[PDB]
Structure 1
Amino acid sequence: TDAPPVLFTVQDTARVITLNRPKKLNALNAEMSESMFKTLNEYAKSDTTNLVILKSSNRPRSFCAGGDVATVAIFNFNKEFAKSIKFFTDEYSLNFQIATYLKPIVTFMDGITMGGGVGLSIHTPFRIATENTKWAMPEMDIGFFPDVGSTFALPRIVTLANSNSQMALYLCLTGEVVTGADAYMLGLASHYVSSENLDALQKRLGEISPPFNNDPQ
């Protein structure tokens, strides 16, 4: 009866995953993570799905404002530590699935991509940014650590002043917000596409297919 937290739809041979928690800026809870993790395993087995597209239904307001840690805090105050460990096992397991996924995943970072949102895009070779992109890792102000494998990605993908993870440490320790073109130039985004062109791109992604006897992997 209630609107599902994450919506799944078909786009020709592409499968669109849309985060559907607009009031929470698409914050990721255990329910969302579990749903996405299970549906991605099915798409991996399917021979009719060529690629996946992870977007939000709230763009350009936000793509994912981060994992739902406010709920994890209440669990700690209530000693519901089993609930908290379930929230992190689901999220981190989804971040590991995306990183090792054999089919192309294309994340549309059209809006605030902070925290868990970074985990949804940083692990995909096709992480598209827009003028509305706002990448940040504001965990130091909440007392947490840089999670979602950001300590394995940022030290390996940043482009400038990252010979010894200097820039990676700057973003993780200061929580600086990077915006649009700057995220693309730093390596946080693989591509820079105007938000207006996302509809057209989505259609083209659904229409392309592996040629002859080549699999999508």
Structure 2
Amino acid sequence: HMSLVTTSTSDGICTVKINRPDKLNAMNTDVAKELIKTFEELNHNDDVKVIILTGEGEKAFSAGADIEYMSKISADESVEYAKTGQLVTATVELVKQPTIAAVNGFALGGGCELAMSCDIRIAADTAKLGQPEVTIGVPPGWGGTQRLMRIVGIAKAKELVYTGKMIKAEEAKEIGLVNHVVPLASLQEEALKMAQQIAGNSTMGVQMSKVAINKGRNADLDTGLGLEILAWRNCFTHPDRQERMT
């Protein structure tokens, strides 16, 4: 169902738009499977620097909460969705290439947990955000409880989880979730401002840094420096360290 084009300065920006408008980008197993293949075949591709994560068309980014609901099973098979859900939520946040959740339209349900998987959660001002997983009696399982609370904090993380109501993109700008609130079709052009300003930088000083921030939150301050100095030492062994010193 996925789509992709590869074009930028020196050939390529990995535009990924989940294309299945009938169910409004609902996150099933297949829409969770092909993401791995399209993001792990992209793992060893040296011709793509920056990745933008957007939704197809003009309807929504992902609306799998109140649209995709077939979970009438025993609880044993629920873990298989939990294991598969965690196989997709973190594999986007662990791709070395900087990925941006270029959110447009509705981004609740799976998209509520998928949007928080990128680096900068820049979203369309049309985005109505929320986590309507609790309204059916089940807390989010793909990582919406232990990843959100480290982004906006804990004072506000309770409000959008305990309640289960939809909030706007402008309202989300006061909590630190969305790092920039900007229009949707400009977000197509305005992301390219930030999708090649990133590319205009080095090729190793960005992804190697991504190995330090994405793993320094799980360790204390002293151990956090323990990973950063080697990364400072590792990027110190690149031809890009001395090329741009002019």
Q: What TM-score does the superposition give when structure 1 sets the normalisation length?
A: 0.82
Q: 1:172 to 1:214 in 2, by over 3 A?
A: same
**Match of 1:104?**
98
Distance 1:101 1:51 in 2: 10
**Match of 1:122?**
116
Distance 1:149 1:135 in 2: 16
Deviation of 1:211 after TM superposition, in Å, equals: 4.2
Deviation of 1:50 after TM superposition, in Å, equals: 0.4
Tell me how many residue pairs correspond in the alignment: 202
**Match of 2:89?**
95
Structure 1: unaligned runs, 5 residues or longer:
none
**Match of 1:194?**
183
CA contact (8 A) 1:62 1:113 kept: yes
Question: Which structure shows the bigger proportion of residues in strand conformation?
Answer: 1
Deviation of 1:86 after TM superposition, in Å, equals: 4.0
Deviation of 1:89 after TM superposition, in Å, equals: 2.7
Structure 2: unaligned runs, 5 residues or longer:
208-246
CA contact (8 A) 1:28 1:116 kept: yes
- Kindly indicate whether residue 150 of structure 2 is the aligned counterpart of residue 152 of structure 1: no
**Match of 1:7?**
3
- Kindly indicate whether residue 168 of structure 2 is the aligned counterpart of residue 173 of structure 1: no
CA contact (8 A) 2:35 2:88 kept: yes
Task: From the CA coordinates, give the structure whose radius of gyration is larger.
Answer: 2
CA contact (8 A) 1:184 1:192 kept: yes
Percent sequence identity is: 25
Q: Which residue identity does 1:96 align to in structure 2?
A: A
CA contact (8 A) 1:110 1:195 kept: yes
Deviation of 1:216 after TM superposition, in Å, equals: 4.8
Deviation of 1:35 after TM superposition, in Å, equals: 0.5
Distance 1:119 1:10 in 2: 26
Q: Which residue identity does 2:161 align to in structure 1?
A: C
Distance 2:203 2:82 in 1: 39
Deviation of 1:117 after TM superposition, in Å, equals: 0.1
Distance 1:11 1:132 in 2: 27
Deviation of 1:147 after TM superposition, in Å, equals: 2.6
Distance 1:213 1:201 in 2: 22
| Highest RCO, 1 vs 2 (Cα 8 Å, sep ≥ 6) | 1
Misfit runs of 4+, over 3 Å: 79-82, 84-88, 202-208, 210-216
**Match of 2:60?**
62
